[PDB]
Every structure is written in C-alpha cells, then in structure tokens.
Structure 1
Amino acid sequence: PIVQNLQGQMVHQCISPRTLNAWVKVVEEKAFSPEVIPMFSALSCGATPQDLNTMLNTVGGHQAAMQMLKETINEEAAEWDRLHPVHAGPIAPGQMREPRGSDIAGTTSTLQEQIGWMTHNPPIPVGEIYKRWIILGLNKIVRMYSPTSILDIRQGPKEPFRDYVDRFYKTLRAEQETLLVQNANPDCKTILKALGPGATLEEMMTACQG
C-alpha cells in the first residue's frame, strides 16, 4: 500500500504477509458473509490497484463469484472511460497520464504509474476508485449468495425474542421495522402491539423477554 512514513511524503510499501494471510483466511472461514466486505476494506487500507488484484488473486476457489467480480469491474471500468475520455498528447514533465478504466483496475498500469497517481498533488486515488468498484461487485455477490429471504424469518412459538431478532437483522444485512413485529410469535406480537408504533428495539426486546 501507500503509507505516509516518518516524513510527510506518501510512499509505497510491500503488502505484509499478515495482510495476505488475513484476507485468505477470512474468505476460507466466512466465504461471502456480509462482514467479509468491511474486513476487505480494512485489510486493503491504502492499497494500490496492484495490491487489490493481489488480494483477489490469492483467493482459491469461489471462482464463480470472482468471475462475477470480473464482469462488474469491467462494467465500472467501461463507465469510467465513458465519463473520462483520455485526451491525447505528450505528458508534461512531472505529470501523469490520465488513467483509463483498465488502468484503475491495474490491468494496463504499472506499479510506478499507480504510485504516481496516488501520490500526485492533487492525487488520483485509483486505489480507492478500484476498491469502490470491487466492494460494489462484492455486495452483489453477498446478495446473490444470501440464502434466506426476510419474509421467511419468523419467530418460533418457543423461540426467544432475542434469538429471533438476531436471525432477522442477520438476514436483513445479507439482503441489504414493522415486518419485525409482524413476524413475531402470537404471544410477543400481542405485547408489541400494546407497546405503540414508535417503540425502539431495546424497548421491544425488553417487552418480550422470557
């Protein structure tokens, strides 16, 4: 990634073995759960487009999702070229050429060019633009691999209300208020209807404790 060192300058440093291993392990253990996306954004802090492709390439398996990640990046890269056409001409000394979509994705750009774009003044955050494309495609993967719909998360007759709300918002996070009340069991729904329409979650959970 690009990290500010002891001085104020932004400089490139190699991706650490801990970062490489942490990203590989979180995909092996949690696949494409919703919490894998913010873990990816944190492990790729300040990452160059080369570092982003490194993390995505180290993932063995799940190639159906990774191929869908290819098509999404290609769609976003094509829209970038539609909105930012590169103007031909010799690049002035001390300046950088305009990045294309494939340049932001690290396909037609070198590490030196990515360092120049990200450390420019003003900078061209090609790493954050690429990560924004990857996270978008990763969110489409999480929604596609979401197994349960929010309409099928109903509280059991003996299920504690806390455990049911855990399953409700867990499914809601993968799929990306009153339905929570409607899907409760008859005993708790009677309690929640007498509580008022403007109750908080900690008020609803406290009312249906057992």
Structure 2
Amino acid sequence: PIVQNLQGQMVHQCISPRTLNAWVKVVEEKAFSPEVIPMFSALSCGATPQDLNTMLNTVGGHQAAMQMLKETINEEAAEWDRLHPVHAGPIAPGQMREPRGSDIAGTTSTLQEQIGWMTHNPPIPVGEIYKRWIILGLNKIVRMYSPTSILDIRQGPKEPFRDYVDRFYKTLRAEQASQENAATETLLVQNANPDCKTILKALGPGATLEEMMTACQG
C-alpha cells in the first residue's frame, strides 16, 4: 500500500502477511456473502493496483467468479479509454505519462508508475479507481451467488420472529448486494406466520421494524 510516514511523506510499504492471509481466509470461509465486500475494501485500504491484483490472484478457488471479474474489469478499462484517450508524443520533464485503462488495472504499468501517479501533485488515485471497478464486479458476483429468492422466505410455524427476520434481511442483502422500501415492507408482513401476521396487521401501516419485533416477541 501507500501510507503516510513520520516525516509526513506518502511512501510505499509492502503488503503484509497479516493482510494477505486475512483476505484469503475470508474468501475461504464466507465465499461471496455480501459482507465480504466491506471486508475487501477495508483490507485494501491504500492499495496500489499491484496490491489489488495480488489480493485477487491469491484466491485459489472460485475461478468462475474470478473470470467474471476479469471481464467486468476489462469493460471498465475500455470505458475509461473511451472517456480518457491518451495523447501521442513525448512526456514533459517532471510529468507522468497519462494512464490507460490497463495502466490503472496494473497490467501495463510498473509499481514505480503507480506510485508516481498516487503521490503526484495533484494525485491520480489509480488505486482507488481500480478498487471501484473491482467492487463493481464483486457486487455482480454477490448478486449472482445469492442462494435464495426473497419470495421463498416464510416464517416457520414454531420459528421465533427474530430468526425469521434474520433470514429475511440476510437474503435480501445478498440479492441486491446491498443493505438499502414499501414493497419489502408489505412482503415481510405478508410472509409472517399466522399469529404474527394478525398482530402486525393490527399495528397498522408505517410501523418501524423495532415496533414489529417487539410486538411478536415470544
């Protein structure tokens, strides 16, 4: 990554054994559960495009996903080139060449160049731009790998309301690759078991999730 030292300079620092292992374990243990994305973004704080490629490439399984991710990255890189053509000609002294899409993805750029861009004044945050593409791709994969439609989540006859709401929102989160309406509100009440369904209908519209859960406790 690129971190701030004691003298206040932005310097390069080797990616750590802790970080490498943490990311590899997360993938092994949680596959593409939604929460894996916030974890990737945090573990890659300050990352260079090289560091980002290191983290992706250390993943052993899930090659189908890794391959989809490559395609998404290539799309974004092409889009970037469309919007940011590169000028022919020589670079002025004290200046950096302009980054192509493949430069931002660390494919055609060196570490020195990546560092050059990230610590230039003004900076070109190639690490943060690349990270945004990767996260786009990761979101697609999370939605795809979502194991259950929200329509199939229905409260067991003897299942506590909390356990059912847990299943509901865990499922909802995977389907949109997001934690962010009236439709789901109606669907949640609709799929509750008989006893709860009536009590909930009784609270009327505009009830907070807190009120609903208090209402159906045991």
Deviation of 1:8 after TM superposition, in Å, equals 2.0
Partners of 1:94 and 1:23 in 2: CA distance: 37
Structure 1 segments unaligned to the other structure (5+ residues): none
User: In terms of mean alpha carbon deviation, does 41-50 or 189-198 score higher?
Assistant: 189-198
Deviation of 1:61 after TM superposition, in Å, equals 1.1
Count of matched residue positions in the alignment of Structure 1 and Structure 2: 209
Partners of 2:86 and 2:163 in 1: CA distance: 54
User: What is the percent sequence identity of the aligned residues?
Assistant: 100
Deviations 1:40-74 (A, max 9, x none): 00000000000000000000011000000000000
Deviations 1:87-142 (A, max 9, x none): 11211111111111100000000000000111011111110110100011011111
User: In terms of mean alpha carbon deviation, does 83-92 or 131-140 score higher?
Assistant: 83-92
Deviations 1:142-170 (A, max 9, x none): 11110101111111111110000000000
Q: What TM-score, normalized to structure 1?
A: 0.98
Deviations 1:165-187 (A, max 9, x none): 00000001100x22111111111
State whether structure 2 residue 203 is matched by structure 1 residue 195.
yes
Partner of 2:16: 16
DSSP 3-state at the match of 1:198: coil
Partners of 2:76 and 2:3 in 1: CA distance: 26
Q: What TM-score, normalized to structure 2?
A: 0.94
DSSP 3-state at the match of 1:114: helix
Deviations 1:176-210 (A, max 9, x none): x2211111111101011110211111100000111
Deviations 1:5-37 (A, max 9, x none): 112221110000000000111111111111111
Partners of 1:150 and 1:118 in 2: CA distance: 42
Partner of 1:182: 190
Structure 2 segments unaligned to the other structure (5+ residues): 176-184
The ranges of structure 1 where at least 4 consecutive aligned residues each deviate by more than 6 angstroms after the TM superposition are none
DSSP 3-state at the match of 1:6: coil
Partners of 2:70 and 2:19 in 1: CA distance: 22
Partners of 1:208 and 1:64 in 2: CA distance: 43
